[PDB]
């Protein structure tokens, strides 16, 4: 799919993902949720080639849920991101690689810290205060570089995110039909229903 | 743009104390077929210049006609055509170099590598190279094609820099050239045993030697070589 | 398209008097887009240091692979692996992927704990060992690094002098490369102390 | 490459030039292209040097194992083993081989195995890049039941011309004589065969 | 390359970077990406260095001949169209140009034309052009107003190029600032990004992601 | 790369230059291209450097096990056969071009080996980008019944021709002499005709010239007691 | 298919001093892995106190230099023996290069001399005629090896004053002709070590108000 | 450029043309007028390859204005459309053809009739009640086929045009930044400044 | 195609097969490849039939106009006109021509003009696809100053072998004899030359 954004503030991680699904000349859907809850305090957004994106996301989801049940324990965001990276690094030398890029937003309950990981389809992982995939960064990183502060509140993070989306809606040729925004913090995952 | 059809292989040359030596075999190849066995690829211009040419033979014959015409043209209204206003090696080279670069610039090259060897009016040795791209350079030793890879290393052992030229006699230089021609016959699959050699000396003038042969060849050791590894018989 | 220049980055190593130095830039990018300024390319397993340039996924994968192998080595051997032995292990591991290679440019640096002898080594992507006495270079600005090292370097530099030489070699090489920079780290390594220094450099 | 094998009254003689080229560079000017797969079964090799060496080594192994079980193999049998390797691996091989051998029952025999891996039993055979230039000469000058001296002259003259015209051929002319008397190696140098 | 130009209360701000690249190799950090067509006209340079240099220098010759013949300053419209018509003649041949022609006349006021080697000619208020154009757009669009002081407008242009210099690998070196009024342009210095980044970061509180 | 091999009276000598290159850049100025297959079987390699090294170690390893299995000193023909069959199987993709020489109970031997698996026998051989320059020297000065001293001289002169005339070759000459009834003598940097001249200037910097952000001690030691 | 271009290797270096300029270049000429000549001059005195070198494809390099020398001759004929200033020469060379925009001279051109105030000047060109006045520029094969070294040792980049720790830069003090020649020689010695197309000899042309002087130095021949 | 629409109603012709100009990754402008007045009662909208569009339009404009001055007379829409078609038909076999598609909306003052002509870059001319170029027709023709009646008022034409633009804004992937609408009738040409 | 021209004591003789092929189909089995450009200057044609006919027609026109102004042209002159057309139009032509003629001053002369447009004066020449197979035979059997009957036999035997091995050659062997006595045409049928 198209635009996925992530920002890690003081006490939470915020993921914003476009709602459009386009097959060629038509926009088939304008309410698509490009994300999967991997665990109560870990969320993964995704974008890439059709079919592969959802197939990969649900496969990761199933594996983390299996781990959770087996150990009666939630893996740390760092551990989940490493598992995901290895799967993609394995995939890139396969017969047919997963053409999927992901952001992993999680709240580490042990360290009491939000964490944002950016991973591309090659298995290239980086921990970031804010991140993006595709052309999204090209328009939003200059704004984030200017305004971002590590002590931002969740509300300030959402405001900075709105400024990013407004810039995208101005300068991007494609109509991505707005974004679904989700917040990951100590209380879990919730969706901002008005954005 | 074309492709060479009938071709001539290496031209080799070097400077020595009183002049220059140049040599080239008498073969005109047609791919891997050794088609024509009596082709002269050293073409003298007056009594002070020899132009050695490798590559496409049809283009060589064209260049040969340009040089022949150049001599005719220089004589026109020129009372000193056989004296002060005779063609110099440097004039002949610059003309050819101009033509080569013009032809490459029209994307229709003369598919050749050329060495102009001669002695100037003041006795100075002239040796310079030009090819289908219009690229030019000078050196105490010059060689084309396979000669560049095999002859130059041998000739450079005799004259390694400019200061070695006055220390090199015509006997030593010719010996080195003849040896290089033997080595090329051992190792170049598009070479022949028969070759021509030209010496341009500031004292004795132009000496043009035809029908030379590679001699003193080592082949006897071949009898002991059997199989490709383990075979004994 | 060229896997070795998608992410960018550089590593350089140098020997001195009873010491070695290994340095790297901090950039990770997606071609023209700068992504991270905290992507360190130097890792260590005991007292043996390994820098890795090239495709970032393979940098991470190989680090994890050599950590894996040096941990098993230590459990079985009951001692830390030495630079000379680790160099052979890197070479063996790269060559096993001869016809499906990791797109990387590894650089080993360290001091043998028994002989006290400084050691550096470089590799191509398939395992060929370059064991230079003076310096090793790797990455998208390797040509620039060769030029810097070949003029700036002199043998038997003291640790604090070697720091200045390797730092200036990295910094000025990176500034002539679009895909390198965004910070830099220098490790000064002596027989039983290692100092790590982050360098201030232009952020474009 | 210029290679040939010729049957005559007392047996068969193999002949070959000694040139190996990488493009126009002569990588070896004293090559031995006459190779032994059994005591009195030899072959001439043309095409890829790697392929024809690999094949010949495998054949020698097969005939050595044949001999240990069933005694001396026929020339036809040797040719069949060559063919099996050349035919079944035709996609991956570039090999033109002439097989020549002497039995006491069958006397001198020559088999040629071109690129496709077909087999052809002939009184004499020519192959290699240089053979093209001597089809006319060899067809006009070959006779059956020649003497040893006549057959040596026929091969010497034939390969002389092949060498003269083919840039990929040259060096010395090697020959191997196969008769009841035994195995004789001959060599002829440029100064000898160029003046013919 | 990152070049920008924008209209405002005080005229036009022109800001460009200084980097030139051959592949990943940084060929130069001291390139003059603004061309002084006359005391009133500026042109920005993006794409092929030569094409832009040659033909915008040529443009200055045509402008001079116009005002010699017509005894009057050439309009920004007319000047930009000479260049666009010229490159349109060469369309297909492989010219590589993305330029802003900037000026200020009585009849037009402050005017900017984006001119392009595919023949595009666009009048507008804000333009960014080059590999780092997206990065610069972000800072501009969120901070641009008409009622900017010459001082604040100059800083915004400087800050927008810096944003792109940081993120775009093929942008950097230094920033050249110009301010275009009706009596002519005014140069506002060369600013090294290596010094400007640490200065802005410290004073502005931005780039908290980078350690200093 | 320039590598040669030359037979003589009572043995064989091989030699090589010491330059390795990645395109037009010199990666290593003093590269070791003479490899030991066994104590008295050595080979020099041209082509892909990792391949020449890897194929030598593998065959050298198997040759050692073979020698132990048979209670015999290894033979050059065994190294040759094992190398060619391995290289043939990989159809030229293992880019190893080798000159294999050595002494064994059968005598002294000299072979060449190309990447597709073809082998050749000779009294003098050359391989690599500078093989034409070297072969020119060998074809000019080689004779039958060379002495040890004459063969070393001829071999090194052939490498020098490559060093000076081939851009793919340079720096130093390595030699290895294998004589019958003797230990093989490996002469590393036998000739050194390319030492760099002293630089005009010292580029040692004043301490504190580089700007530093942070300092920290790196813990290389294991987890401590108490 | 016929390829009208070739690569003759070589490397050149121009450095502008306070009242002088140097243009240096190695004397080696090559194709592929062969040496054509160990001494083929590459830097030329073009008259009017201007030196020039067009490095890359030597045939185009010779053609360009030849046409510029010609342009100097005709500039004298057409404008009453007026001296062609370095800035005017630079602009003229742009038009020579851009004239063949769609079939370019495959060279990297550098000229050196003195400006009209007597200060040292170096100009640098790309193959299709874009140019810029510079203090320092290397061109050709080993340019990527040499330029970073010159950024560090001529412009004192990334160098700061001891004790201040990054706060105060090393001041940009002017270099004498003897100092510049040291940096040129070390640049080419280093380039010779690590680049196969660089070697044999180094020829330096020095330009001052007194005229054009030449210096030659041996480089490694391997 | 992208979307150009045309509809001929009872007493006028209405042309709607998108405002976006996109160079690859960025939307450089969102107020571009993709039209030229050829004569007081003839308007031409255009879309195709960059540079060529404006160059062709202004070239046609100059030729019609020249005719008007020479004869002191306005050419009929039919005559103008035939001139334009011939220029494009000439162009398609040139060294480098004009890659331009046009709609010509005119009011014939002699016949007192609105007229809409659709011409593509090949020189393919058709007179239509409503028309489009590119993918625009792919969405709109079904709505126009249903709702169109030849006796509509200008206001009804604008309402039907709004329905077409709304469908485009829903199903098209590209953000064309709205449309500029112009009406051609007996009183000349005017722009609807609120749409 | 198999063509040749041979000088001998009394002049020169041209020889040729009569086969023209479109792939493997014989489009004409009785082709005349020996063409007249002047009374006693003829040529043999190989390569493109269109190209070599076009060239020969132009040459005949040039020599006819030469004759009307300057009298009988030499064979060298005829060869030069052929060369000029073949060299200058080398990109667009596929023509291999042998020029043979008889002067009283120069007697029999043979010039061969291969693909590139170069000229080579020779005692005898062979060309065409079939010539490859008789380089050995012709080199061994050619002598200078042969008689008419010997030269006819030499050409007949040579082209017989070329026809035997080359699929692109066949039909009848045509010959044209050029001497002081005049111009004589000869033809030899398969039943005659196949049994040689
Ligand atoms: B001969 O030319 O066929 C020859 C015979 C070979 C068995 C020694 N072959 C070669 O020389 C081939 C190339 C070739 C030339 C002509 C026709 C077919 C093939 N050469 C090699 O196989 C070769 C060359 N250099 C190194 C290794 N192998
Ligand atoms: B900029 O990136 O467009 C820049 C500005 C130029 C007009 C002075 N262009 C370049 O650096 C181009 C390469 C390029 C990079 C990114 C996008 C488009 C083009 N470089 C050159 O034209 C160049 C490189 N080396 C020497 C001379 N010119
Ligand atoms: B020689 O020129 O053959 C030389 C000797 C080598 C066997 C030690 N070879 C090389 O230097 C090769 C050249 C080459 C380059 C690229 C592909 C294949 C071969 N170099 C390397 O193998 C090489 C280059 N850089 C690092 C490591 N190895
Ligand atoms: B001969 O084979 O060269 C022959 C001589 C020609 C002058 C009559 N040429 C042809 O038959 C050519 C094809 C060809 C075959 C072999 C080598 C080169 C060319 N054929 C034609 O030109 C031809 C065939 N069919 C119709 C018309 N022309
Ligand atoms: Cl072999
Ligand atoms: Cl015909
Ligand atoms: Mg990533
Ligand atoms: Mg950088
Ligand atoms: Mg031969
Ligand atoms: Mg940048
Ligand atoms: Mg060098």
Torsion, Cα of H57, H59, H62, H65 (10° steps): -60
Please report the DSSP string for F18-59 in residue order.
Answer: --EEETTEEEESS---EEEEETTEEEEEEESHHHHHHHHHHH
Closest to H173 in 3D by CA, of A72, A20, F144: A20
Q: What is the DSSP letter of A92?
A: T
Find the helix or strand (DSSP H, E) in which F186 lies.
strand F185-191
Question: Angle B170-187/F131-141 helices, nearest 10 degrees?
Answer: 110
Enumerate helices (H) and strands (E) in chain A, giving the number of each.
4, 12
Neighbours of chain D (3+ CB pairs under 8 A): B, F, I
* Token pair belonging to B101: 């670069």
Q: Residue D167: which of F109, B172, B192, I44 has the closest Cα?
A: B192
**Helix, strand, coil abundance in chain F, percent, nearest 5:** 30, 35, 40
Q: What is the experimental method?
A: X-ray
Residue labelled with tokens 């030492």: F195
- Give the orientation angle of helix H154-171 with respect to helix H136-147, to 10 degrees: 140
Q: Taking the mean position of all CA atoms in its chain, how far away is CA F132? A: 18
Question: Which tokens hold the place of A83?
Answer: 């598992």
Looking at all shown ligands, the one closest to residue C131's CA atom is 3
Structure-token pair, residue F226: 């108490």
> For domain F1-226, which CATH number applies: 3.40.50.2300, 3.60.20.10, 3.30.360.10, 3.60.21.10?
3.60.20.10
Residue F97: which of F134, F61, F126, F67 has the closest Cα?
Answer: F126
Interchain CB contact of I134 with D (< 8 Å): yes
- Residue B4 gets which letter from DSSP? -
Tokens of G89: 């020469």
Cα–Cα distances (Å) from I45 to B17, I16, I20, I32, in that order, read: 53, 9, 11, 9
Nearest residue of D to residue F118 by CA position? Answer: D50
Residues in chain H: 195
In total, the C-beta contacts within 8 angstroms joining chain A to chain H are 37
Query: What is the distance between the alpha carbons of residues I189 and H185, in angstroms, rounded to a whole number?
Result: 92
Instruction: Say if residues E53 and E35 touch (Cβ distance below 8 Å).
Output: yes
Domain boundaries, chain E: 1-212
E80 vs E77: CA distance, rounded Å? 5
C-alpha span between G36 and A30 (Å, rounded): 68
Distance from CA of D140 to the nearest CA of I (A): 8
The answer to whether the CB of G36 falls within 8 A of the CB of G46 is no
Closest-CA residue of C relative to F31 is: C130
Cβ-Cβ contacts under 8 Å for A65 (sequence gap 6 or more): A38, A39
Kindly state the tokens that stand for H144: 């126009």
- Three-state DSSP state, I169: coil
What DSSP designation does E47 have? B
Residues H27, A170: C-beta atoms closer than 8 Å? yes
Cα B118 from chain centroid?
11
Instruction: Specify the fold of B1-233.
Output: 3.60.20
- Let me know: does F170 contact F194? Beta carbons within 8 Å: yes
Q: Where are the domains of chain D?
A: 1-196
DSSP string for C106-118: EEEEEE-TTT--E
- Write out chain G residues lying below 8 Å of E31, CB-based: 132
Q: Which two tokens stand for residue C171?
A: 């910094």
Give residues with Cβ within 8 angstroms of E49, minimum separation 6: E20, E31, G126, G130
Phi, psi of B190 (to 5 degrees): -115, 35
Q: Kindly tell me the burial class for residue I121, based on how many C-beta atoms sit within 10 Å of its own C-beta (0-12, 13-18, 19 or more).
A: middle
Q: Token pair of E88, please?
A: 């349109």
Q: What is the dihedral of CA H17, H23, H29, H32, to 10 degrees?
A: -30
Partner residue opposite E135 with nearest CB, options A129, A138, A150: A138
> What's the half-sphere exposure (Cβ side, CA atoms, 13 Å) at A89?
22
D165 CA from centroid of ligand 9 (Å): 6
The set of residues, in sequence order, having a beta carbon less than 8 Å from that of E22 and lying 6+ positions away, is none
Residue of I1, I7, I52, I151 marked active site? I1
Helices B146-155 and F148-165 cross at an angle (nearest 10°) of: 120
Token couple for E51: 């094409």
| F192-197, Cβ contacts within 8 angstroms, sequence gap of 24 or more | F193/F160, F193/F163, F193/G222, F194/F163, F194/F170, F194/G220, F194/G222, F196/G189, F196/G193, F196/G220, F197/G189
Cα distance between residue B4 and residue H30, in whole Å: 59
**Burial of residue C67, with CB atoms counted within 10 A of its CB: 0-12 exposed, 13-18 middle, 19 or more buried:** middle
Both structure tokens of B188? 């170049």
How many residues are recorded in chain C?
Answer: 204
F134 and F2 Cβ atoms separated by less than 8 Å: yes
Structure tokens at F53: 């090294």
Among I17, I133, I136, I141, the residue to mutate for chain D (most D Cβ within 10 A): I136
Domains in chain A: ranges and CATH: 1-195 (3.60.20.10)
Picking from I44, I31, I36, I86, the residue whose alpha carbon sits closest to that of residue I60 is I36
Give bridge partners of residue E123 from the DSSP assignment.
E113
CA distance B27 to B9: 8
What ranges in G20-108 are assigned the alpha helix state H?
Answer: 58-78, 86-98
Asked if residues I23 and I15 have their Cβ atoms less than 8 Å apart, the reply is no
Q: How far is CA A115 from the centre of its chain?
A: 11
- What whole-number distance in Å separates Cα of residue E98 and Cα of residue E194? 26
Category of D8 on φ-ψ map: left (φ > 0), alpha (ψ -120 to 50) or beta: beta
Breaks in chain I after (C-N > 2.5 angstroms):
none
- Which residues have any ligand 1 atom within 6 Å of their CB? D 1, 20-22, 27, 31, 33, 45-49, 52, 128-129, 168; F 114, 118
* Ordered structural domains, chain C, with CATH: 1-204 (3.60.20.10)
Name the helix (H) or strand (E) containing G137.
strand G136-140
**CB-CB contact of G113 with G151 (8 Å):** no
CA of E48 to the centre of ligand 2 (A): 5
Whether G182 contacts chain F with CB within 8 A: yes
F119 alpha-carbon distance from chain centroid: 18
Is there a contact between B10 and B57 (Cβ–Cβ < 8 Å)? no
State how far the alpha carbon of G76 is from the alpha carbons of C91, F131, G89, in Å: 66, 54, 12
Asked whether F34 and F12 are in contact (CB, 8 A), the reply is no
Say which residues have a Cβ less than 8 Å from residue G34's Cβ, sequence separation at least 6.
B148, B149, B152, F165, F166, F167
**Cα H31-H37-H43 angle, rounded to 5 deg:** 95
**I: neighbours with 3+ CB pairs under 8 Å?**
B, D
From CA I32, how far away is CA I111, in angstroms rounded? 20
- A192 in reach of chain C (CB within 8 A): no
G182 to each of B74, C154, F118, F200, how far by Cα in Å?
A: 51, 17, 52, 5
The residue with tokens 């090697």 is D174
Half-sphere exposure of I135 (CA within 13 A, CB side): 23
- Cross-chain CB nearest to C37 (options E25, E172, E210): E210
* CA I40 – CA I181 distance, rounded (Å): 11
For residue G77, the tally of other CB atoms under 10 A from its CB is 8
Q: Which whole-number Å values give the CA distances from G21 to D189, G61, G87, G119, G176, in the listed order?
A: 65, 21, 14, 8, 10
Question: Is residue C28 classed exposed, middle or buried when 0-12, 13-18 and 19+ CB atoms within 10 A define those classes?
Answer: buried
Which residue, among A40, B6, G209, has the nearest Cα to I120 in the 3D structure? B6
In Å, what is the CA distance from C149 to each residue of C94, C164, D123, G136?
Answer: 26, 12, 71, 20
Q: What are phi and psi of H180, to 5 degrees?
A: -95, 125
DSSP state letter for F183: -
Exposed, middle or buried by CB within 10 Å (0-12, 13-18, 19+), for G213? middle
Q: Is E211 on the interface with C (CB under 8 A)?
A: yes
The H or E element that residue A23 is part of is strand A21-23
d(CA C146, CA E22): 19
* Ligand 10 centroid, distance to C138 Cα (angstroms): 21
Question: Domain E1-212 belongs to what topology?
Answer: 3.60.20
Chain A CB contacts of H171 below 8 Å? 26-27
Q: Are B219 and D190 in contact (CB under 8 A)?
A: yes
Residues 6+ apart with CB under 8 A from H84: H44, H60, H102, H104, H119
Does D168 lie at the interface with B, CB-CB under 8 angstroms? yes
Given an 8 Å threshold on Cβ–Cβ distance, is B58 in contact with I116? Answer: yes
DSSP string covering E103-119, please?
EEETTTEEEEEEEETTS
Resolution in angstroms comes to 2.5
Dihedral sign for Cα atoms in the order F153, F154, F157, F163 = negative
Contact D85, D31 (CB under 8 A): no
The three-class DSSP label of residue C180 is coil
Which residues, at least 6 apart from B217, have a Cβ–Cβ distance to it below 8 Å? B182, B185, B186, D190, D191
G126-to-B214, E52, E189, G55, I160 alpha-carbon distances in Å: 50, 13, 26, 10, 65
Locate tokens 């007028």: which residue?
H33
CATH of domain D1-196: 3.60.20.10
I1 is catalytic: yes
Q: Provide the 10 A C-beta neighbour count for residue B47.
A: 12
Contact G178, C135 (CB under 8 A): no
The length of chain D in residues reads 196
Instruction: Identify each DSSP E strand in D114-165 by its residue range.
Output: 120-122, 124-127
DSSP calls for chain H: ---EEEEE-SS-EEEEEE--EEETTEEEES----EEEEETTEEEEEEESTTHHHHHHHHHHHHHHHHHHHHTSPPPHHHHHHHHHHHHHHHTTSSS---EEEEEEEEETTTTEEEEEEE-TT--EEE-SEEEETTHHHHHHHHHHHH--TT--HHHHHHHHHHHHHHHHHH-SB----EEEEEEETTEEEEES--
CATH of region G1-222, choose from 3.40.50.300, 3.20.20.80, 1.10.3720.10, 3.60.20.10: 3.60.20.10
Angle CA A8–A10–A12, to nearest 5: 55
Residue whose structure tokens are 């340039």:
C53
Would you list the DSSP string of B135-174? -EEE-SEEE-THHHHHHHHHHTTT--SGGGSTT--HHHHH
DSSP structural state of residue I10: T
């Amino acid at each position: 799919m198209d635009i996925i954004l992530g920002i890690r503030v003081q006490d939470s991680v915020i993921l914003a993902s476009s709602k459009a699904v386009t097959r060629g000349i038509s926009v088939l859907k304008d309410s698509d949720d490009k994300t999967r809850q991997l665990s109560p305090h870990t969320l993964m957004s995704f974008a890439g080639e059709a079919g592969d994106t959802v197939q990969f996301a649900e496969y990761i989801q199933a594996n983390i849920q299996l781990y959770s049940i087996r150990e009666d324990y939630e893996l740390s965001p760092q551990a989940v991101s490493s598992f995901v990276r290895q799967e993609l690094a394995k995939s890139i030398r396969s017969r047919r690689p997963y053409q999927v890029n992901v952001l992993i937003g999680g709240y580490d309950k042990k360290k009491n810290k939000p964490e944002l990981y950016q991973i591309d389809y090659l298995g290239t992982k980086v921990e970031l205060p804010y991140g993006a995939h595709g052309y999204s960064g090209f328009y939003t990183f200059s704004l984030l570089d200017h305004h971002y502060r590590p002590d931002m509140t969740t509300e300030e993070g959402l405001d900075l995110l709105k400024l990013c989306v407004q810039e995208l809606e101005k300068r991007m040729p494609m109509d991505f039909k707005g974004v679904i925004v989700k917040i990951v913090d100590k209380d879990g995952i919730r969706q901002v229903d008005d954005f | 743009t074309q492709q060479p059809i009938v071709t001539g292989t290496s031209v080799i040359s070097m400077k020595y104390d009183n002049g220059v030596i140049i040599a080239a075999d008498n073969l005109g190849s047609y791919g891997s077929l050794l088609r024509f066995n009596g082709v002269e690829r050293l073409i003298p211009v007056g009594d002070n210049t020899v132009v050695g040419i490798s590559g496409d033979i049809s283009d060589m014959q064209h260049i040969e006609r340009l040089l022949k015409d150049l001599v005719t043209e220089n004589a026109y209204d020129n009372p000193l055509a056989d004296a002060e206003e005779a063609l110099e090696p440097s004039y002949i080279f610059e003309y050819l170099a101009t033509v080569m670069y013009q032809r490459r610039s029209k994307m229709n090259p003369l598919w050749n590598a050329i060495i102009v060897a001669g002695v100037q009016s003041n006795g100075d040795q002239f040796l310079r190279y030009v090819n289908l791209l219009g690229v030019t350079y000078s050196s105490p030793t010059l060689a084309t094609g396979f000669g560049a890879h095999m002859a130059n290393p041998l000739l450079r052992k005799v004259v390694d820099r400019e200061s070695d030229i006055p220390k090199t006699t015509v006997q030593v230089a010719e010996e080195a050239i003849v040896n290089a021609m033997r080595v090329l016959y051992y190792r170049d699959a598009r070479s022949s045993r028969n070759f021509s050699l030209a010496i341009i000396d500031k004292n004795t003038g132009l000496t043009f030697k035809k029908n030379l042969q590679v001699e003193n060849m080592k082949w006897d050791f071949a009898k002991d070589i059997k199989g490709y590894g383990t075979q004994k018989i | 398209s060229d896997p070795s220049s998608i992410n960018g980055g550089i590593v350089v190593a140098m020997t001195g008097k009873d010491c070695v130095a290994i340095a790297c830039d901090l950039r990770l990018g997606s071609q023209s887009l700068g992504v991270s300024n905290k992507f360190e390319k130097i890792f260590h397993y005991g007292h043996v240091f390994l820098g890795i340039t090239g495709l970032a996924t393979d940098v991470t994968t190989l680090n994890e692979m050599f950590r894996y192998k040096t941990n098993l080595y230590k459990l079985k051997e009951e001692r830390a692996i030495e630079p000379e032995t680790f160099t052979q292990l890197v070479s063996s591991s790269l060559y096993e992927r001869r016809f499906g290679p990791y797109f990387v440019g590894p650089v080993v640096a360290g001091i043998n704990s028994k002989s006290g002898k400084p050691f550096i080594a470089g590799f191509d992507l398939i395992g060929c060992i370059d064991e230079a006495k003076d310096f090793i270079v790797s990455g998208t600005a390797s040509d620039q690094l060769f030029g810097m090292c070949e003029s700036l370097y002199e043998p038997n530099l003291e640790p604090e002098d070697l720091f200045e030489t390797i730092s200036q070699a990295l910094l000025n090489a990176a500034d002539r490369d679009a895909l390198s920079g965004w910070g830099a780290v220098v490790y000064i390594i002596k027989k039983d102390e290692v100092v790590k220094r982050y360098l201030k450099m232009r952020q474009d | 490459t210029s290679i040939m094998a010729v049957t005559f009254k007392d047996g068969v003689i193999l002949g070959a030039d000694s040139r190996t080229t990488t493009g126009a560079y002569i990588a070896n000017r004293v090559t031995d292209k006459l190779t032994r797969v059994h005591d009195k079964i030899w072959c001439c090799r043309s095409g890829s040097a790697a392929d024809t060496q690999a094949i010949a080594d495998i054949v020698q192994y097969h005939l050595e194992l044949y001999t240990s079980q069933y005694g001396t193999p026929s020339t036809e049998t040797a040719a069949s083993v060559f063919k099996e390797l050349c035919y079944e691996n035709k996609d991956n091989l570039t090999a033109g081989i002439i097989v020549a051998g002497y039995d006491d029952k069958n006397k001198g025999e020559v088999y040629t195995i071109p690129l496709g891996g077909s087999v052809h039993k002939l009184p004499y055979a020519i192959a290699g890049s240089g053979s093209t230039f001597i089809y006319g000469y060899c067809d006009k000058n070959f006779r059956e039941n020649m003497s040893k001296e006549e057959t040596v002259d026929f091969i010497k003259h034939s390969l002389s011309q092949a060498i003269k015209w083919d840039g990929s051929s040259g060096g010395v002319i090697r020959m191997v004589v196969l008769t009841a008397a035994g195995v004789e190696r001959l060599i002829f140098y440029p100064d000898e065969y160029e003046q013919l | 390359t990152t070049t920008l130009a924008f209209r405002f209360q005080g005229g036009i701000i022109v800001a460009v970077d200084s980097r030139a690249t051959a592949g990943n190799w940084v060929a130069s950090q001291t390139v003059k990406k603004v061309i002084e067509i006359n005391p009133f006209l500026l042109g920005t340079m993006a794409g092929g260095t030569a094409d832009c240099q040659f033909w915008e220098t040529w443009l200055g010759s045509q402008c001079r001949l116009h005002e010699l013949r017509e005894k009057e300053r050439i309009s920004v419209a007319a000047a930009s169209k000479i260049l666009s018509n010229l490159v349109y003649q060469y369309k297909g041949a492989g010219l590589s140009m993305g330029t802003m022609i900037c000026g200020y006349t009585r009849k037009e006021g402050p005017t900017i034309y984006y001119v392009d080697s595919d023949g595009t000619r666009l009048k507008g208020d804000i333009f960014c052009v080059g590999s780092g154009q997206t990065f610069a757009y972000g800072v501009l669009d969120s901070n641009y107003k008409w009622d900017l002081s010459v001082e604040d407008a100059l800083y915004l242009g400087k800050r927008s190029i810096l944003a792109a210099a940081h993120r775009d690998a093929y942008s950097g070196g230094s920033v050249n600032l110009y301010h275009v009024t009706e009596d002519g342009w005014i140069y506002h210095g060369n600013h090294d990004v290596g010094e400007l980044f640490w200065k802005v970061k410290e004073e502005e509180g931005s780039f908290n992601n980078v350690i200093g | 790369t320039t590598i040669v091999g030359v037979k003589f009276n009572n043995g064989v000598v091989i030699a090589a230059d010491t330059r390795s290159t990645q395109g037009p850049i010199v990666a290593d100025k003093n590269c070791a291209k003479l490899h030991r297959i066994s104590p008295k079987i050595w080979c020099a390699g041209a082509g892909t450097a990792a391949d020449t090294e890897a194929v030598t170690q593998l065959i050298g390893s198997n040759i050692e096990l073979h020698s132990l299995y048979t209670s015999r000193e290894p033979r050059v023909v065994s190294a040759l056969q094992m190398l060619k069959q391995h290289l043939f199987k990989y159809q030229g993709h293992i880019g190893a071009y080798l000159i294999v020489a050595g002494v064994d109970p059968t005598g002294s031997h000299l072979f060449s080996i190309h990447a597709h698996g073809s082998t050749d026998v000779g009294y003098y051989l050359s391989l690599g980008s500078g093989s034409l320059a070297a072969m020119a020297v060998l074809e000019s000065h080689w004779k039958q019944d060379l002495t040890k001293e004459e063969a070393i001289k001829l071999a090194s002169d052939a490498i020098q021709a490559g060093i000076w005339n081939d851009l793919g070759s340079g720096s130093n000459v390595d030699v290895c002499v294998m004589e019958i009834g003797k230990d093989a003598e490996y002469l590393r940097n036998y000739l050194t005709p390319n030492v760099r001249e002293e630089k005009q200037k010292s580029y040692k910097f004043p301490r504190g010239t580089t700007a530093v952000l942070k300092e920290s001690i790196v813990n290389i030691c294991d987890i401590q007691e108490e | 298919q016929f390829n009208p271009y070739g690569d003759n290797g070589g490397t050149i270096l121009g450095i502008a001093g306070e009242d002088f300029a140097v243009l240096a270049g190695d004397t080696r000429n090559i194709t592929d892995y062969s040496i054509n000549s160990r001494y083929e001059p590459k830097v030329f005195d073009c008259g009017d106190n201007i030196v020039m070198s067009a490095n890359g494809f030597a045939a185009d390099g010779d053609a360009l230099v030849k046409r510029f020398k010609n342009s100097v001759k005709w500039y004298h004929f057409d404008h009453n023996d007026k001296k062609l200033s370095i800035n005017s020469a630079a602009r003229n060379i742009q038009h020579l290069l851009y004239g063949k925009r769609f079939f370019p001279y495959y060279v990297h051109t550098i000229i050196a001399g003195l400006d009209e105030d007597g200060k040292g000047a170096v100009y640098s060109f790309d193959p299709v005629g874009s140019y810029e006045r510079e203090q320092c520029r290397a061109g050709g094969a080993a340019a990527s090896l040499i330029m970073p070294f010159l950024d560090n040792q001529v412009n004192f980049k990334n160098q700061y004053e001891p004790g201040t720790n990054g706060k105060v830069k090393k001041p940009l003090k002017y270099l004498s002709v003897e100092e510049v020649i040291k940096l040129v020689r070390d640049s080419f010695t280093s380039a010779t070590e690590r680049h196969i197309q660089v070697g044999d000899g180094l020829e330096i042309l020095i330009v001052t108000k007194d005229g054009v002087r030449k210096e030659f130095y041996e480089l490694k021949r391997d």
